[PDB]
Amino acid sequence: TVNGFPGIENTEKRHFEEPRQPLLNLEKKKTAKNILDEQGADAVVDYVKNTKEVLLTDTTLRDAHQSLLATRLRLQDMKGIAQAIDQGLPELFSAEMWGGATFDVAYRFLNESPWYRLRKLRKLMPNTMFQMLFRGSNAVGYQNYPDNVIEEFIRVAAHEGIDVFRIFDSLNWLPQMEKSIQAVRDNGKIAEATICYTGDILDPSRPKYNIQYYKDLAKELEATGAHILAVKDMAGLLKPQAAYRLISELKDTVDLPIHLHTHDTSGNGIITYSGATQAGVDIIDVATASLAGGTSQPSMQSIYYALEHGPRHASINVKNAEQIDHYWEDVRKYYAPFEAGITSPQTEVYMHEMPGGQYTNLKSQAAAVGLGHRFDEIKQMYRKVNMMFGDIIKVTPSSKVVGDMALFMIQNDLTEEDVYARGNELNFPESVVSFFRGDLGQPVGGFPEKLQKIIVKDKAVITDRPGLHAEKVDFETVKADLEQKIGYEPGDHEVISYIMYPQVFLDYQKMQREFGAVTLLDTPTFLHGMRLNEKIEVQIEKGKTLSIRLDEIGEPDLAGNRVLFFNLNGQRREVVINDQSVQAQ
Amino acid sequence: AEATICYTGDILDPSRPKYNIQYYKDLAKELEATGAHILAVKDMAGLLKPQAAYRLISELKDTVDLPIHLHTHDTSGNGIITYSGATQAGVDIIDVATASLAGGTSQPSMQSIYYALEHGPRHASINVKNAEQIDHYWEDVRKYYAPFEAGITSPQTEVYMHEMPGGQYTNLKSQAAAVGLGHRFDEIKQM
Amino acid sequence: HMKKLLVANRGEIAVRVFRACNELGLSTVAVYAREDEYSVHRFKADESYLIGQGKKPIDAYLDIDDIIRVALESGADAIHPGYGLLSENLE
Ligand SMILES: Nc1ncnc2c1ncn2[C@@H]1O[C@@H]2COP(=O)(O)O[C@H]3[C@@H](O)[C@H](n4cnc5c(N)ncnc54)O[C@@H]3COP(=O)(O)O[C@H]2[C@H]1O
Numbered sequence: 001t002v003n004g005f006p007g008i009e010n011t012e013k014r015h016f017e018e019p020r021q022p023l024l025n026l027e028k029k030k031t032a033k034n035i036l037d038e039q040g041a042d043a044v045v046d047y048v049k050n051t052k053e054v055l056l057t058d059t060t061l062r063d064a065h066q067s068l069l070a071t072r073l074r075l076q077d078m079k080g081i082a083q084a085i086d087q088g089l090p091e092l093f094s095a096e097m098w099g100g101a102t103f104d105v106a107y108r109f110l111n112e113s114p115w116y117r118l119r120k121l122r123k124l125m126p127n128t129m130f131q132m133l134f135r136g137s138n139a140v141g142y143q144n145y146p147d148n149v150i151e152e153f154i155r156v157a158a159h160e161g162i163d164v165f166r167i168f169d170s171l172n173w174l175p176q177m178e179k180s181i182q183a184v185r186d187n188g189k190i191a192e193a194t195i196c197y198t199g200d201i202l203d204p205s206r207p208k209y210n211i212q213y214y215k216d217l218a219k220e221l222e223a224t225g226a227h228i229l230a231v232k233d234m235a236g237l238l239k240p241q242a243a244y245r246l247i248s249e250l251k252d253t254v255d256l257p258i259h260l261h262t263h264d265t266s267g268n269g270i271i272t273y274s275g276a277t278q279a280g281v282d283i284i285d286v287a288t289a290s291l292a293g294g295t296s297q298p299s300m301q302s303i304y305y306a307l308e309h310g311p312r313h314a315s316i317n318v319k320n321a322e323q324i325d326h327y328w329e330d331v332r333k334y335y336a337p338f339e340a341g342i343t344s345p346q347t348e349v350y351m352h353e354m355p356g357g358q359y360t361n362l363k364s365q366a367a368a369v370g371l372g373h374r375f376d377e378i379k380q381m382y383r384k385v386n387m388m389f390g391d392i393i394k395v396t397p398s399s400k401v402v403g404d405m406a407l408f409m410i411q412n413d414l415t416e417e418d419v420y421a422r423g424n425e426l427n428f429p430e431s432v433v434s435f436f437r438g439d440l441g442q443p444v445g446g447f448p449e450k451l452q453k454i455i456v457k458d459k460a461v462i463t464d465r466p467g468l469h470a471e472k473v474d475f476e477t478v479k480a481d482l483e484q485k486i487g488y489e490p491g492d493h494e495v496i497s498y499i500m501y502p503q504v505f506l507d508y509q510k511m512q513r514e515f516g517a518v519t520l521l522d523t524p525t526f527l528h529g530m531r532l533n534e535k536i537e538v539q540i541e542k543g544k545t546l547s548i549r550l551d552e553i554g555e556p557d558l559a560g561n562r563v564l565f566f567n568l569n570g571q572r573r574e575v576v577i578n579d580q581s582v583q584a585q
Numbered sequence: 586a587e588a589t590i591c592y593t594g595d596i597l598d599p600s601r602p603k604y605n606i607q608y609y610k611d612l613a614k615e616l617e618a619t620g621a622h623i624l625a626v627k628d629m630a631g632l633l634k635p636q637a638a639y640r641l642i643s644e645l646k647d648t649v650d651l652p653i654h655l656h657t658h659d660t661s662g663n664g665i666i667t668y669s670g671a672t673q674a675g676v677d678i679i680d681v682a683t684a685s686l687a688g689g690t691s692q693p694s695m696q697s698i699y700y701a702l703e704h705g706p707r708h709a710s711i712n713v714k715n716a717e718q719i720d721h722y723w724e725d726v727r728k729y730y731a732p733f734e735a736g737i738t739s740p741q742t743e744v745y746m747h748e749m750p751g752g753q754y755t756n757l758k759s760q761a762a763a764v765g766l767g768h769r770f771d772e773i774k775q776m
Numbered sequence: 777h778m779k780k781l782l783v784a785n786r787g788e789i790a791v792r793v794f795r796a797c798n799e800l801g802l803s804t805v806a807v808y809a810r811e812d813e814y815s816v817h818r819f820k821a822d823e824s825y826l827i828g829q830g831k832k833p834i835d836a837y838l839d840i841d842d843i844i845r846v847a848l849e850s851g852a853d854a855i856h857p858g859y860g861l862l863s864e865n866l867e
Pocket residue numbers: 240241244245271274275276277278310635636639666669670671672673705
């Protein structure tokens with residue numbers, strides 16, 4: 001109240017209505033979660049192939065607010081609609097609700113444990129399969145980790161309620177995914193091996209990623225124990241005819257079901273999904289219409305109505321989908337400071353091929369420095385850097401390397417010839433150094449040999465899997481260190497979260513000891529604090545509802561500490577908080 | 586002269602027989618009885634599904650000899666696939682807009698409909714680089730009209746139940762908010 | 777066999793039975809109306825639930841079905857009526 005939320009600007013707390021609850025016509029039916037629970041993953045795969053209609057994956061809970069609200073969707077907003085989604089939408093194959101940037105961003109900003117969110121969503125959604133975007137050698141981070149850490153993370157995630165494991169690689173490398181796929185197979189869950197799409201397969205001018213490359217990649221992914229093959233289009237580059245050709249050639253090649261993930265950045269997502277449905281795709285990733293379009297996935301209602309009169313239908317209940325969309329439209333207005341702005345179909349993404357989240361992050365980073373008006377030449381530098389690296393796949397964390405390299409190249413006024421010749425003595429950001437040192441992995445076709453020697457001067461460059469070249473982690477010693485650092489016995493999930501994010505978990509525990517569980521507040525109260533004479537009810541526990549009313553805000557004293565006169569549980573309590581704007585003693 | 590058939594209802598739904606394909610065929614014949622140069626199909630609410638678009642354009646192309654001018658809105662979010670389906674059925678001219686002012690309520694993007702037909706049997710007669718360069722100017726000047734923008738626009742599939750045009754939808758919402766009935770705007774839509 | 781008690785009353789007697797149950801070791805469940813949201817007995821129990829929504833507060837405390845539903849959904853075993861309200865009610 002007296003200092004404002006960090007990051008966003010200080011504004012008055014607007015009055016928000018109670019969001020529109022859905023009116024669902026419940027139809028009880030057997031879902032894929034039950035088939036996984038009693039029969040198994042192979043029975044789930046057989047059920048997917050035996051379904052004529054295209055299955056849908058709801059990416060509302062992770063990717064829709066990743067690409068639009070910058071992963072700022074709190075668990076409190078998902079808790080009011082998770083039961084309604086689980087009941088009124090039983091035809092969904094899976095719901096993507098975990099992994100990706102959510103794991104880091106929740107700890108860093110939302111001050112809530114993603115394990116707590118997973119536990120709550122597993123409680124409120126017992127009949128829906130959960131999916132996390134696993135990223136190969138990395139899991140939620142950006143640096144390499146040893147194999148036992150990844151296996152422990154997979155074991156804990158599968159124990160806590162993750163059913164589908166979508167594992168991709170930043171450079172489409174199979175050594176970085178085989179261990180994760182085998183661990184998911186051993187844990188008894190569905191392993192979704194993922195092909196990261198890039199370039200154009202119908203353009204002869206770019207022959208590095210042709211149809212044959214994706215065909216052999218799908219072949220050698222089928223050689224592993226992958227349950228469902230996945231095609232991830234992070235930048236929305238999949239043209240509809242290219243989508244039809246790719247899905248047809250992959251169905252003629254392997255026998256695994258195909259899962260298509262693409263974005264509506266070019267505005268051609270719906271027709272791409274329809275063309276993949278004609279070619280025989282099985283599952284597609286679609287979000288609700290309130291959080292669809294633009295940077296996010298195509299709408300599930302739009303893809304239902306596009307295939308309503310076609311030869312192949314979409315397995316969804318669109319009345320319940322619109323009823324859920326009412327609530328999502330109502331709760332989108334809570335995240336007004338986190339909106340990117342006016343959205344539009346950007347066909348420029350066919351040139352620079354930025355992922356949408358990376359596009360927004362690069363735009364914010366360029367606005368944070370004195371280069372906010374140079375975004376067009378930033379895009380040109382991004383395209384030229386991607387070409388000069390050898391046409392690598394742009395997805396996290398490899399897209400972050402390209403973005404940081406373009407930002408460094410345009411910030412210090414560099415040139416392709418200048419970097420290629422003069423920049424031997426020039427410094428470089430650590431992301432490009434780590435990428436050329438083999439931390440991310442081996443790209444297809446190998447590094448540019450001369451430019452690598454220019455970029456890294458004398459540091460060690462590996463050519464194998466970076467997991468073998470990492471220091472082993474003993475869980476007992478790090479468990480004891482976490483226990484003495486936080487003062488209580490941690491679980492397996494706390495240990496595996498502390499291993500990947502050492503400082504972030506400690507900061508989260510510090511804010512947990514300071515402010516407590518702030519995940520139980522509603523979003524306007526979480527962001528804008530409280531108003532004068534405003535009464536709120538906070539349910540800290542089932543049966544325990546705090547009654548908080550703010551009566552007065554005192555003037556700041558000489559020491560700078562304001563006194564706030566609260567009415568907690570009907571009784572007056574004065575809270576002393578230090579104002580950060582007085583700057584006086 | 587562009588004689589215009591105002592599209593409404595669904596032609597692939599047997600539950601609504603008042604606006605079947607035969608009515609539109611009779612209307613096209615009656616409009617070709619005059620000296621109309623180009624036949625136009627104004628889908629003012631984004632009601633034209635792509636299969637319905639293909640069927641309508643085919644059954645109008647075998648009926649009359651005038652060129653077909655398709656106009657639809659992207660309110661349902663299925664404007665691009667509708668335009669491509671009409672392109673496969675043999676439509677002649679489609680109504681598009683620049684990418685800065687496309688999507689949502691307005692017409693589908695010209696760049697998006699060019700890239701949707703880039704590797705098809707029928708291409709789109711446009712220069713996409715100049716279109717994107719003009720789209721840059723339109724994006725720059727769209728920020729001048731910030732008080733006149735109608736908030737966050739998303740693909741609304743409720744336009745299949747109530748069939749308001751988008752401008753009439755915004756005007757009705759503004760009038761409902763101006764008379765104190767904005768909290769039951771869903772009730773107003775059902776009404 | 778008895779591990780949780782509900783008090784279908786308000787004011788002094790509710791806190792008295794709460795203290796008796798906490799001395800005996802049982803858990804406590806409270807009931808309150810919207811007009812009684814600031815009462816002491818609401819915050820003196822382990823869990824508290826709102827009864828008689830949209831009714832007169834005296835009639836809210838006399839709602840037999842609402843108290844029964846709260847006691848069933850809260851896992852309560854016993855119900856102490858206190859004095860007054862539904863203490864002498866046979867129904
Ligand atoms: N004879 C017909 N009867 C009924 N509807 C017809 C039709 N021709 C087109 N349509 C409808 O119009 C939609 C868009 O047509 P389009 O061929 O341009 O756009 C297609 C096309 O670009 C591509 N595609 C589909 N089958 C293909 C093939 N054998 N080769 C290449 N592309 C194909 O996938 C896109 C979307 O596929 P989708 O069929 O679901 O969506 C089609 C379909 O619903």
